[PDB]
Design a protein around this ligand. Structure first.
Ligand SMILES: C/C=C(\C)CC/C=C(\C)CCC=C(C)C
Lengths: 65, 188, 339
């Protein structure tokens, strides 16, 4: 955790790498399509209120003339 | 440019620093030697001023493209339109004005453009009657005056009824201001 | 200790990982959104112009209030602006002109910056004895400070050219946690909305998600064939966008542990250095090395518009928390607010 980089050896760097990789192999990966669906839904639900997409009426635009 | 970032962000800073110490004096981007140097060189404030100044001037100069035009060119057919936007230097901004004589704003805009074109000879200003675009019935009176701005084949902006977003009685300066507030006009 | 065997195991592990991803890579975002109508042509306009800096703007960062913003410039000055009235609230002389980043505390109490000086300087804004000199100077990184983001008044995370990222305890100036993992200069970092996690992009073509509280790397994302210069977390915290030298913006989803979409076009050849999402996350604004900015449609993977009409004058950019505006910096010392 509180590691000083310049002091590590080629070996224990690979050790930390493999340790990290082992941990990453056990990752519960979700299906891309599913994730894309959720991404789309989230965006679509809020896209209609997005100031930068819909535009800001001069009336409520904080950056007046 | 082309390739590795060296003009913006961290890398931009790195390269700028290098150019500084060159003009006055893979996985890793900086060499150990360069690092030691930053922790050893006492930068002269005066040189810093001159550098900052010169850098902005270099960019100003690299973006200033020679005066090649100065007039509002008339496009007879939609073909001339396609040809002008494609057969043109990618660095040249093109401002096309689809219009129709007698329509509110169309005439006023055309007048302003005449002078705007003279003010910005680096920008190619073109005009074309809606009847001459040949685009079915897309560019109609409810859309006119339309102002399209292209650059390197890319459509930067498409303004519908541009005049409605200008003063009742506008002039060259107004169109100038409008386009400047969109970064569509180069510098003088 | 046999290196060959260790690095060999690493490869087989990496092989196992890629396959797992491929098994899940059954479709692309574009397909899922092929029925979503494209957003109207995004044509933002300049509202405010911040005049003050005497040189090229390197970085800028919005404050939680979406009003006050900070901007680090080559002129060796950190300025806190009032976007609403273009007025200068604070002017802070820096010890170096080479500032790579500048953070703004979510409380507005502090502001930070760092660069080729390898130190993350912190300044106190709200005080009887106002601070313009320095409160703390987080020294430790053996490489330039590329990015930093405040967690609170006492903690801040910093990425560096020394291949490391780190969490610091401002009060002590000590490096609480050091995030090791990248094999190249870390170029950017972005905190998750809940600050418990944060992702970082580096010159090793990989983005790493780290658990702040645990001090270790959770997941490592790959895809770019070049250094990742910028990275920005998505509002819901389940994904993030990256920008690299290969001229492509990529959207990585945490759960999927891979890219859902890629953003590019044959005409685009400049490396991406700035990336920011809109409030709804519908737009992915990307600043390129040619000082241009493209407003991408995160969903349809097509570009919705051009920010700053390709005037070759965008060195940095950022979106307000309320999504009411986009601020841009330039090499000509000026900053502009768009919406
Ligand atoms: C009114 C114009 C100026 C005072 C100089 C130009 C200002 C800038 C270039 C700010 C950078 C923003 C852009 C994306 C153009």
């Amino acid at each position: 955790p509180v590691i000083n980089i310049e002091d590590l050896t080629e070996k224990d760097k690979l050790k930390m790498e493999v340790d990290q990789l082992k941990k990453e192999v056990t990752l519960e990966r979700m299906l891309v399509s599913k994730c894309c669906e959720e991404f789309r839904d989230y965006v679509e639900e809020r896209s209609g209120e997005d100031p930068l997409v819909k535009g800001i009426p001069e009336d409520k635009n904080p950056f007046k003339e | 440019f082309e390739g590795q970032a060296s003009h913006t962000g961290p890398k931009g800073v790195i390269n700028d620093w290098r150019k500084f110490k060159l003009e006055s004096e893979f996985s890793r981007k900086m060499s150990v030697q360069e690092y030691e140097l930053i922790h050893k060189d006492k930068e002269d404030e005066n040189c810093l001023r001159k550098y900052r100044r010169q850098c902005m001037q270099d960019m100003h100069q690299k973006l200033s493209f020679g005066p090649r035009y100065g007039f509002v060119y008339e496009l007879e057919s939609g073909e001339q339109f396609l040809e002008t936007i494609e057969k043109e230097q990618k660095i040249t901004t093109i401002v096309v004005h689809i219009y129709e004589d007698g329509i509110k704003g169309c005439d006023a805009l055309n007048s302003s453009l005449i002078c705007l074109a003279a003010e910005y000879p680096m920008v190619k200003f073109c005009k074309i009657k809606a009847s001459n675009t040949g685009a079915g019935d897309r560019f109609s009176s409810d859309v006119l005056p339309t102002l399209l701005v292209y650059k390197g084949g890319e459509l930067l902006s498409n303004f519908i009824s541009v005049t409605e977003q200008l003063a009742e009685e506008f002039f060259t300066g107004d169109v100038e201001s409008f386009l400047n507030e969109y970064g569509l006009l180069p510098e003088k | 200790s046999e290196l060959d065997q260790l690095r060999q195991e690493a490869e087989q592990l990496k092989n196992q990982i890629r396959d797992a991803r491929k098994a899940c890579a059954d479709a692309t975002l574009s397909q899922i959104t092929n029925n979503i109508d494209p957003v109207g042509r995004i044509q933002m306009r300049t509202r405010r112009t911040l005049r003050g800096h005497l040189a090229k703007i390197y970085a800028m960062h919005w404050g939680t209030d979406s009003r006050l913003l900070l901007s680090a410039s080559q002129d060796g000055k950190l300025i806190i602006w009032d976007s609403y009235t273009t007025n200068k609230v604070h002017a802070i002389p820096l010890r170096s002109s080479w500032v790579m980043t500048c953070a703004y505390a979510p409380s507005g109490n502090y502001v930070a910056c760092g660069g080729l000086d390898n130190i993350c300087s912190i300044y106190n804004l709200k005080t009887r004895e106002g601070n313009v000199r320095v409160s703390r100077e987080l020294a430790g990184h053996t490489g330039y400070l590329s990015c930093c983001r405040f967690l609170d008044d006492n903690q801040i995370v910093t990425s560096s050219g020394d291949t490391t990222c780190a969490l610091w305890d401002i009060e002590t100036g000590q490096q609480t946690t050091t995030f090791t993992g990248h094999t190249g200069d870390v170029m950017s970092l972005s905190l998750a909305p809940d600050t418990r996690l944060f992702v970082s992009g580096a010159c090793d073509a990989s983005a790493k998600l780290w658990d702040v509280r645990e001090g270790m790397c959770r997941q490592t994302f790959t895809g770019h064939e070049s250094d990742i210069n910028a990275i920005c977390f998505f509002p819901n915290g389940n994904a993030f966008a990256t920008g690299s030298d290969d001229a492509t913006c990529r959207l990585f989803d945490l759960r999927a542990d891979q890219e859902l979409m890629t953003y590019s076009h044959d005409n685009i050849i400049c490396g991406i250095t700035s990336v920011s999402f809109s409030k709804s996350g519908r737009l992915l604004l990307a600043g390129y090395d040619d000082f241009n900015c493209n407003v991408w449609d995160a969903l349809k993977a097509d570009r919705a518009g051009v920010l700053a009409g390709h005037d070759n004058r965008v060195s940095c950019l950022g979106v307000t928390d309320d999504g009411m505006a986009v601020a841009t910096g330039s090499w000509d010392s000026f900053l502009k607010i768009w919406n």
